[PDB]
Amino acid sequence: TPVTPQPPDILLGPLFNDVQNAKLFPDQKTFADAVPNSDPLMILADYRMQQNQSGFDLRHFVNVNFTLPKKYVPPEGQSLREHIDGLWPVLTRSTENTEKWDSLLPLPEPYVVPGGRFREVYYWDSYFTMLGLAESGHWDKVADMVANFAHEIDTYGHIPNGNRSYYLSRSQPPFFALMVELLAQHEGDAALKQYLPQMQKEYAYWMDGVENLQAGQQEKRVVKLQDGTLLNRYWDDRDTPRPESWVEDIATAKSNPNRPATEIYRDLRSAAASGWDFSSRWMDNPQQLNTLRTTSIVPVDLNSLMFKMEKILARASKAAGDNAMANQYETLANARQKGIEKYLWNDQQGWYADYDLKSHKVRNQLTAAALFPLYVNAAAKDRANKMATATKTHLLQPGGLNTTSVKSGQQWDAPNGWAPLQWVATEGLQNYGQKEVAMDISWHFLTNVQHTYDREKKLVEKYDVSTTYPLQDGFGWTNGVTLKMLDLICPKEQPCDNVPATR
Amino acid sequence: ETPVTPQPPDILLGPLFNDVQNAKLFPDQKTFADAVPNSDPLMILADYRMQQNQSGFDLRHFVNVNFTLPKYVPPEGQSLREHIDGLWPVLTRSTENTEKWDSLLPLPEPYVVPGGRFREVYYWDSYFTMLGLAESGHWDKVADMVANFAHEIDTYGHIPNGNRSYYLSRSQPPFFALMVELLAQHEGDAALKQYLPQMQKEYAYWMDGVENLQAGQQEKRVVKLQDGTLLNRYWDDRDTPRPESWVEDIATAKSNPNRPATEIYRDLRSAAASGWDFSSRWMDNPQQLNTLRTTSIVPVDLNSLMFKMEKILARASKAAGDNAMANQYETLANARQKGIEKYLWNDQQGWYADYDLKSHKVRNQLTAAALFPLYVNAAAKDRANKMATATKTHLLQPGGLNTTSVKSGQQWDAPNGWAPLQWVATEGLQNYGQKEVAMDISWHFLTNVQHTYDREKKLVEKYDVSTTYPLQDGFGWTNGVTLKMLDLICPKEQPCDNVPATR
Ligand SMILES: OC[C@H]1[C@@H]2[C@@H](O)[C@H](O)[C@@H](CO)N2C[C@@H]1O[C@H]1O[C@H](CO)[C@@H](O)[C@H](O)[C@H]1O
Ligand SMILES: OC[C@H]1[C@@H]2[C@@H](O)[C@H](O)[C@@H](CO)N2C[C@@H]1O[C@H]1O[C@H](CO)[C@@H](O)[C@H](O)[C@H]1O
């Protein structure tokens, strides 16, 4: 019997809703990750029967019908570098077969997870994680992960936000082609050839529907502007509350009776697809999450990543010996680059930004997403220079690169600094010889990382850059980026294992 | 690892699907939607892209190589009844195993298909088909079919329009509960007890999201009116062209640049979910299919079936010995009946009708859907007597019951007569003692059916009632309804095998 993976709200019906609303567990993700002990359809029937009988106890019912999700001790005195290098096994999972009905989706090879409540692989986190794995010589683990993503492309049609049934309805910022280039650093062109069809199938997922799409319209993850410019947006195929944030999403939508709930759920999910759940970047009112409108906003990071995909597809086509095909992908990438420079650059403010599909204007706000055009080498040299200035002036802080300069109360905003954006900014700036700002981001963020390591003996998911669910530890992309920056800031011939206290 | 069910062909194959359909290599768009890929679609897409980048690429040859297309002499002298009874094995499929990428979905038990291009099981057709199977003693097949539908509810969460990957995003008019009751006629309460959990799970699919829906809003298949009244609508979870009608749907949306294509696609798919694809019933302008707005219309047929589902759920609960649960279901059914009498009855005109979410008013048009509240015994007697009058004056025709009185050019409109509606109308009228009208419909429709049989020796999907893709032959529901009607119109001790020439 083939399986058709269904998310927990669908599998369990209102029992899911009831358990989440009762908040039997302090994290909504906990019950999303419960494994039913038997056919969920029969559990549901048993539940209706038991509610209509005498002394029913929901907590007792759950305990007998579900299995729920289940402390690293390093040797003493490790440097920052040793600590990170020793954590890889702790963050590695091997889940080749899962119980029927489990929300965790099987994967053929071992994979590194972020840490803490994140007990599954994450699409964009993995790239940054794999950079650290590659840096420390764990190439089997890098190849394992590229294989896992290729397998998901093959089985599902795309790479899901992560390997959970409740993540299938969306993807995440697309780094798979970049992971294939990373593997190519170790295996050579062989990597490009090995994964060309999977890269092409991913691209087709992102571009699905494009060829029948009329100008001025959108569908799924594609937009076609009035002049025919083709760009992508983040989109989730569902319009209901996220199982893993069930009560929160319902509260968010209920707090705004001015919009149908379904529209708000779709925008929340699509912001989860963007990786930036959540951010003033998406909101009409920077202090009210319930005003977000992610699907009406064309993201400049996503589109930089799509240019990069198209450029890598050209390189892999060529390596496969398909020259005419490589030229087709170059032509595609050239158009993407024109689209970015016209529609994703704000000439009044002097920086890259998202495009607004409601107002048909470039948006005003500067965020760390504005560095992606540099990261992918799509940007004009003159605009890269302006981005260095914008960065120095508005985003660089003592503890690293600020996500935005808006303190909204949300995670993807001031004062939060996120490792992936530190690295994207650093690499972006270096691409255009802006070494000083690059180095400032790197030193500032590392100093922040080392400080928390000294005091707490750990690394965490994000950092407050104003000085150098609860906060989670581990932590995949922080670890990977820390290794890359460490190497960057000390000479190649005399590497440091902790951030030097004096620059 | 357990194999996953494939995506629909458009998603599976990428732009190759779109290309093959646009080229109209086959005269039926459904043909390529039913193509079996000979290897992994991921590799086929890559091969396609590569070969397009060469001289003399031939699309048709590429399809011939990479896909396999889908693949009766009765004894002489059969009466109409004997012909039908001999055809059951001809229309019966056994497909316990399918190739991993076939759009055909596996089923564990044999099943009767409608005929012709309908090479898969259909949700609502199957009920009328199973009535015929039951009448001619084929209870094994009835049980096979109920088991199949219970299995789909278990694996997918609902019964799809049919067992095809491109039907998974929608259901059909819900008859599963009535199929269980049919089987209960032979088995007794054993059937209700056995399938109670699957009936409950189908109900949860129809009502999914209801717990958190605010008054005045809709979501998926549920609507909640401003006074809190709960009703259902037809809904498809996708908003793209139907693979099996690809070019038609694209042309339809293209001809109305006043609406986003995705909304039109969602409304086309939702009409397919209603079984009435297509009809003036859903359309603002009857010569523009592109003006249909299915998802903004509360259907009186669907909501009658929902009432009947609730009634059957109470009856099954009682048979399983849970009296309090049974009373809960009775209460829901009572609420549904009030909803129907209030929002799905047009008192100005004196007939049942759909409710319009856009204008907040009961609609004016009389269609054969209006007999549904009689069929499920939801209607007040005085309203049933009015329906008999309405039926005589507007719908009854020499060749049977007209679907509507509007000759739009669409299939579910004058002058087309469809077997399921003949039977729904006949039984509903009989439920309220309106014997004369019910017999007229039966004699008139049967005479139509007999004459096509006399001339062409076949039964077909629909009939022109003004007198007694191309037209399909078989035909499951026509065969089922004809057996029930033949038994109805002749004395028990003088059964007929052909419709008598003189009533
Ligand atoms: O802002 C918190 C995000 C952040 C993502 O950017 C990372 O991909 C991920 C793990 O490091 N991460 C946690 C959170 O996203 C995940 O968790 C939420 C629920 O808390 C999911 O809804 C989201 O889809 C998932 O990526
Ligand atoms: O009027 C055409 C409908 C009619 C449905 O009411 C029946 O369920 C079905 C088979 O007898 N039937 C043919 C057609 O619907 C089917 O075919 C179309 C494409 O031609 C699909 O889009 C539709 O989903 C499917 O039910």
Swiss-Prot record, chain B:
Name the major location. Answer: periplasm
| Catalytic activity, EC | 3.2.1.28
Q: Name which cysteines form disulfide bonds.
A: none
Instruction: List the GO cellular component terms.
Output: outer membrane-bounded periplasmic space
> Which family is annotated?
Belongs to the glycosyl hydrolase 37 family.
Q: How does it assemble?
A: Monomer.
Q: Which NCBIfam families match?
A: PRK13270.1, PRK13271.1
Q: What is this protein called?
A: Periplasmic trehalase
Q: Which organism is it from?
A: Escherichia coli (strain K12)
